[PDB]
Subunit: 76 residues, 4 copies
């Protein structure tokens, strides 16, 4: 056991490699999750405005149909 | 035949009565036909204006339906 | 005045002519009034059925508009 | 410098603490990003189906309006 420090040294090297590798891995996954979150915010805002416009349109159509009913019903 | 003129006279009286009666009859029927003709002109003008108003209404209803279709179709 | 009867005779002839002429005149006017009355009945029945069909149509249009309103209003 | 190893030892302890702390931090942020991504998928699928139903409704309304126009236009 005249080389305990060489074994400590070798062990520390391997652990540093595992930790560096973990860093690379976890950061990369973070950037991918963040990227796809940003994409998600875009899609969600898009769909929100779309639903808003569709419902506004349905209100306009309702007013026209009501006008047509008034006109028609004076005739009956 | 010492009274031929009395027979002429009696015959003329009867014919005058028949003609007077015919006058009364035909005039009365004329007034009734004229009366009901005037009624007919009223009904016909009434129905004419009614049909006019109904068709005008149908044009207004058509414009409203067309507007509603435009509004609806922008949404599809 | 040895010809009173000739004067009666001449007067009767003239009156018969006036009455015959009146007959022709009044009958002719009767046929014309009757003719135009019959025409009037045709026009009136025509317009009646027309108004009937138009109002029936307006009821059908009303049902369609009501259906369109139901469909539209579920969306709002 | 009779205690170089004590200084190595102390340094290693501090680095292990920094790395452990980093682990806690990055995992926690991962769980939060994943959580909010899952929420995002729910919202997006919800809005998708909503837009689908709204557009289907607009097609139904269009057919009704077209029927009403047919009915109306036979009248004009």
């Amino acid at each position: 056991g005249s080389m305990g420090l060489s074994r400590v040294y070798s062990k520390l090297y391997k652990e540093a490699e595992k930790i560096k590798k973990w860093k690379v891995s976890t950061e990369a996954e973070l950037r991918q999750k963040e990227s796809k979150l940003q994409e998600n915010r875009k899609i969600i805002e898009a769909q929100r405005k779309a639903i808003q416009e569709l419902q506004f349109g349905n209100e306009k159509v309702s007013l026209k149909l009501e006008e047509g009913i008034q006109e028609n019903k004076d005739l009956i």
